[PDB]
Enzyme design. Structure first.
Site, PDB file in Angstrom:
ATOM      1  CG  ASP A 150      -0.104  -0.129   2.548  1.00  0.00           C
ATOM      2  OD1 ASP A 150       0.849   0.063   2.715  1.00  0.00           O
ATOM      3  OD2 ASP A 150      -1.008  -0.191   3.602  1.00  0.00           O
ATOM      4  CG  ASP A 204      -2.144  -8.604   6.116  1.00  0.00           C
ATOM      5  OD1 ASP A 204      -3.167  -9.446   5.853  1.00  0.00           O
ATOM      6  OD2 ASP A 204      -2.309  -7.885   7.277  1.00  0.00           O
TER       7      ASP A 204
HETATM    8  O1  LIG Z   1       1.360   7.067  17.429  1.00  0.00           O
HETATM    9  C1  LIG Z   1       2.344   7.455  16.428  1.00  0.00           C
HETATM   10  C2  LIG Z   1       1.579   8.109  15.178  1.00  0.00           C
HETATM   11  O2  LIG Z   1       0.470   7.193  14.808  1.00  0.00           O
HETATM   12  C3  LIG Z   1      -0.073   7.772  13.611  1.00  0.00           C
HETATM   13  O3  LIG Z   1      -0.869   6.514  13.183  1.00  0.00           O
HETATM   14  C4  LIG Z   1      -0.415   5.549  12.558  1.00  0.00           C
HETATM   15  C5  LIG Z   1      -0.504   4.348  13.403  1.00  0.00           C
HETATM   16  O4  LIG Z   1       0.244   4.611  14.456  1.00  0.00           O
HETATM   17  C6  LIG Z   1      -0.051   3.024  12.542  1.00  0.00           C
HETATM   18  O5  LIG Z   1      -0.309   2.120  13.435  1.00  0.00           O
HETATM   19  C7  LIG Z   1      -1.031   3.197  11.308  1.00  0.00           C
HETATM   20  O6  LIG Z   1      -0.265   1.847  10.532  1.00  0.00           O
HETATM   21  C8  LIG Z   1      -1.090   1.523   9.349  1.00  0.00           C
HETATM   22  C9  LIG Z   1      -0.044   1.339   8.073  1.00  0.00           C
HETATM   23  O7  LIG Z   1       0.315   2.444   7.751  1.00  0.00           O
HETATM   24  C10 LIG Z   1      -0.655   0.766   7.105  1.00  0.00           C
HETATM   25  O8  LIG Z   1       0.021   0.298   5.988  1.00  0.00           O
HETATM   26  C11 LIG Z   1      -1.416  -0.665   7.565  1.00  0.00           C
HETATM   27  O9  LIG Z   1      -2.368  -1.084   6.649  1.00  0.00           O
HETATM   28  C12 LIG Z   1      -2.148  -2.534   6.420  1.00  0.00           C
HETATM   29  C13 LIG Z   1      -3.707  -3.154   6.847  1.00  0.00           C
HETATM   30  O10 LIG Z   1      -4.165  -2.504   7.783  1.00  0.00           O
HETATM   31  C14 LIG Z   1      -4.046  -4.599   6.642  1.00  0.00           C
HETATM   32  O11 LIG Z   1      -5.315  -4.937   6.009  1.00  0.00           O
HETATM   33  C15 LIG Z   1      -3.037  -5.463   6.258  1.00  0.00           C
HETATM   34  O12 LIG Z   1      -2.609  -5.452   7.584  1.00  0.00           O
HETATM   35  O13 LIG Z   1      -1.835  -4.664   5.468  1.00  0.00           O
HETATM   36  C16 LIG Z   1      -2.148  -3.188   5.224  1.00  0.00           C
HETATM   37  C17 LIG Z   1      -2.237  -2.658   3.775  1.00  0.00           C
HETATM   38  O14 LIG Z   1      -3.169  -2.739   2.694  1.00  0.00           O
HETATM   39  O15 LIG Z   1      -2.241  -0.461   8.849  1.00  0.00           O
HETATM   40  C18 LIG Z   1      -1.782   0.074   9.847  1.00  0.00           C
HETATM   41  C19 LIG Z   1      -2.419   0.205  11.139  1.00  0.00           C
HETATM   42  O16 LIG Z   1      -3.579   0.923  10.672  1.00  0.00           O
HETATM   43  O17 LIG Z   1      -0.555   4.297  10.582  1.00  0.00           O
HETATM   44  C20 LIG Z   1      -0.820   5.409  11.246  1.00  0.00           C
HETATM   45  C21 LIG Z   1      -0.551   6.642  10.318  1.00  0.00           C
HETATM   46  O18 LIG Z   1      -1.612   6.495   9.248  1.00  0.00           O
HETATM   47  C22 LIG Z   1      -0.648   9.002  13.906  1.00  0.00           C
HETATM   48  O19 LIG Z   1      -1.404   9.159  12.822  1.00  0.00           O
HETATM   49  C23 LIG Z   1      -0.025  10.114  14.459  1.00  0.00           C
HETATM   50  O20 LIG Z   1      -0.571  11.221  14.988  1.00  0.00           O
HETATM   51  C24 LIG Z   1       0.773   9.422  15.662  1.00  0.00           C
HETATM   52  O21 LIG Z   1       1.800  10.222  16.220  1.00  0.00           O
HETATM   53  O1  LIG Z   2      -6.824  -7.096   3.830  1.00  0.00           O
HETATM   54  C1  LIG Z   2      -5.593  -7.471   3.930  1.00  0.00           C
HETATM   55  C2  LIG Z   2      -5.127  -7.806   2.476  1.00  0.00           C
HETATM   56  O2  LIG Z   2      -6.034  -8.301   1.580  1.00  0.00           O
HETATM   57  C3  LIG Z   2      -5.477  -8.153   0.300  1.00  0.00           C
HETATM   58  O3  LIG Z   2      -6.510  -8.623  -0.857  1.00  0.00           O
HETATM   59  C4  LIG Z   2      -6.860 -10.075  -0.424  1.00  0.00           C
HETATM   60  C5  LIG Z   2      -8.416 -10.041  -0.242  1.00  0.00           C
HETATM   61  O4  LIG Z   2      -8.799  -9.479   0.953  1.00  0.00           O
HETATM   62  C6  LIG Z   2      -9.087 -11.420  -0.554  1.00  0.00           C
HETATM   63  O5  LIG Z   2     -10.448 -11.598  -0.526  1.00  0.00           O
HETATM   64  C7  LIG Z   2      -8.375 -11.969  -1.813  1.00  0.00           C
HETATM   65  O6  LIG Z   2      -8.959 -13.333  -1.713  1.00  0.00           O
HETATM   66  C8  LIG Z   2      -9.394 -13.967  -3.082  1.00  0.00           C
HETATM   67  C9  LIG Z   2      -8.311 -14.836  -3.907  1.00  0.00           C
HETATM   68  O7  LIG Z   2      -7.186 -14.079  -4.316  1.00  0.00           O
HETATM   69  C10 LIG Z   2      -9.147 -15.346  -4.918  1.00  0.00           C
HETATM   70  O8  LIG Z   2      -8.213 -16.076  -5.677  1.00  0.00           O
HETATM   71  C11 LIG Z   2     -10.436 -15.958  -4.670  1.00  0.00           C
HETATM   72  O9  LIG Z   2     -10.280 -17.466  -4.848  1.00  0.00           O
HETATM   73  O10 LIG Z   2     -10.886 -15.809  -3.205  1.00  0.00           O
HETATM   74  C12 LIG Z   2     -10.585 -14.699  -2.417  1.00  0.00           C
HETATM   75  C13 LIG Z   2     -11.758 -13.882  -2.407  1.00  0.00           C
HETATM   76  O11 LIG Z   2     -12.137 -13.767  -0.969  1.00  0.00           O
HETATM   77  O12 LIG Z   2      -7.055 -11.974  -1.584  1.00  0.00           O
HETATM   78  C14 LIG Z   2      -6.561 -10.782  -1.713  1.00  0.00           C
HETATM   79  C15 LIG Z   2      -4.981 -10.966  -1.865  1.00  0.00           C
HETATM   80  O13 LIG Z   2      -4.480 -11.283  -0.574  1.00  0.00           O
HETATM   81  C16 LIG Z   2      -4.986  -6.635  -0.322  1.00  0.00           C
HETATM   82  O14 LIG Z   2      -4.317  -7.094  -1.421  1.00  0.00           O
HETATM   83  C17 LIG Z   2      -4.312  -6.122   0.579  1.00  0.00           C
HETATM   84  O15 LIG Z   2      -4.113  -4.715   0.222  1.00  0.00           O
HETATM   85  C18 LIG Z   2      -4.650  -6.043   2.076  1.00  0.00           C
HETATM   86  O16 LIG Z   2      -3.963  -5.632   3.087  1.00  0.00           O
END
Ligand SMILES: OC[C@H]1O[C@@H](O[C@H]2[C@H](O)[C@@H](O)[C@H](O[C@H]3[C@H](O)[C@@H](O)[C@H](O[C@H]4[C@H](O)[C@@H](O)[C@H](O)O[C@@H]4CO)O[C@@H]3CO)O[C@@H]2CO)[C@H](O)[C@@H](O)[C@@H]1O
Ligand SMILES: OC[C@H]1O[C@@H](O[C@H]2[C@H](O)[C@@H](O)[C@H](O[C@H]3[C@H](O)[C@@H](O)[C@@H](O)O[C@@H]3CO)O[C@@H]2CO)[C@H](O)[C@@H](O)[C@@H]1O
Length: 213
Positions: free
Chosen positions: A12, A122
């Site tokens: 991301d 992830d």
């Molecule tokens: O407290 C210090 C500082 O924090 C700032 O806020 C931060 C958070 O501390 C931090 O946890 C957060 O981190 C994000 C990260 O940037 C994202 O890349 C990540 O995304 C993850 C997603 O959550 C999941 O689906 C999978 O896990 O991977 C992905 C990518 O799709 O999520 C984490 C947690 O949310 O970022 C914040 C900044 O945006 C405050 O803003 C600041 O004021 C504080 O001083």
């Molecule tokens: O939130 C975690 C992560 O998600 C990533 O996308 C995932 C989707 O959440 C997930 O639904 C998808 O799964 C599909 C799979 O890839 C297909 O082949 C199908 O058969 O079934 C699933 C439908 O549920 O997988 C993707 C990839 O892991 C995002 O890419 C990421 O940003 C995010 O952090």
């Protein structure tokens, strides 16, 4: 920590959660980078996913050590844990499904966001999918791919900014385009090569088993 887990793939472009000071007892936090993929010396720079200028570094990407072993990075939500216990920890993943079953990947946790209690890793790979925040839009005008799951074919890596391209290609080149493989995991001391990339080593790193390939 050890146990069973579920994987996804992502990139991301955001500043990773463990790149902030104070998240865990570490040597120093994970490096963040500017939009040009250069390391920042200030660990308090606002995330490019939150209106700021700090992004994920391109060297915090996965690579093949050999045909059976990869090193890389992940966001983690470990059951029973917190950012204090996982940030900058390393885990040996043994895949248990998909084309990569039986291969090993050692990942450092550098972030979080998965469901609490879930043991979701992830796994970071450029082109894995930007998810809810397109920080890649603000960094360099975006990556190709579905928002979730990212690109479909390796040729799309030709469109990636150069520093991200190797990690894009790894997804197809070592990881065999595996789709959310399951794994079991074991917390291990971090390989020096992984700490060299993130900059972050836990104060408790040595309390865990040495990783043996
Ligand atoms: O407290 C210090 C500082 O924090 C700032 O806020 C931060 C958070 O501390 C931090 O946890 C957060 O981190 C994000 C990260 O940037 C994202 O890349 C990540 O995304 C993850 C997603 O959550 C999941 O689906 C999978 O896990 O991977 C992905 C990518 O799709 O999520 C984490 C947690 O949310 O970022 C914040 C900044 O945006 C405050 O803003 C600041 O004021 C504080 O001083
Ligand atoms: O939130 C975690 C992560 O998600 C990533 O996308 C995932 C989707 O959440 C997930 O639904 C998808 O799964 C599909 C799979 O890839 C297909 O082949 C199908 O058969 O079934 C699933 C439908 O549920 O997988 C993707 C990839 O892991 C995002 O890419 C990421 O940003 C995010 O952090």
């Amino acid at each position: 920590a050890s146990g069973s887990g579920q994987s996804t793939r992502y990139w991301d472009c955001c500043k990773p959660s463990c790149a902030w000071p104070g998240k865990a007892a570490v040597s120093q936090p994970v490096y963040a980078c500017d939009a040009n993929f250069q390391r920042l010396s200030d660990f308090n720079v606002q995330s490019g996913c939150n209106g700021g200028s700090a992004y994920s570094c391109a060297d915090q990407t996965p690579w093949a050590v050999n045909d059976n072993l990869a090193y890389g990075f992940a966001a983690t939500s470990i059951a029973g844990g917190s950012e204090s216990s996982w940030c900058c920890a390393c885990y040996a993943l043994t895949f248990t499904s998909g084309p990569v079953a039986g291969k090993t990947m050692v990942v450092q946790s550098t972030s979080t966001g998965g469901d609490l209690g879930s043991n979701q890793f992830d796994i970071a790979m450029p082109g894995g999918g930007v998810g809810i925040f397109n920080g890649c839009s603000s960094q360099f005008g975006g990556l190709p791919g579905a928002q979730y799951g990212g690109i479909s074919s390796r040729d799309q890596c030709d469109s990636f900014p150069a520093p991200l391209k190797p990690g894009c290609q790894w997804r197809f080149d070592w990881f065999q385009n595996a789709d959310n493989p399951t794994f079991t995991f074991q917390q291990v001391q971090c390989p020096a090569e992984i700490v060299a990339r993130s900059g972050c080593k836990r104060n408790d790193d040595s309390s865990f088993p040495v990783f043996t390939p």
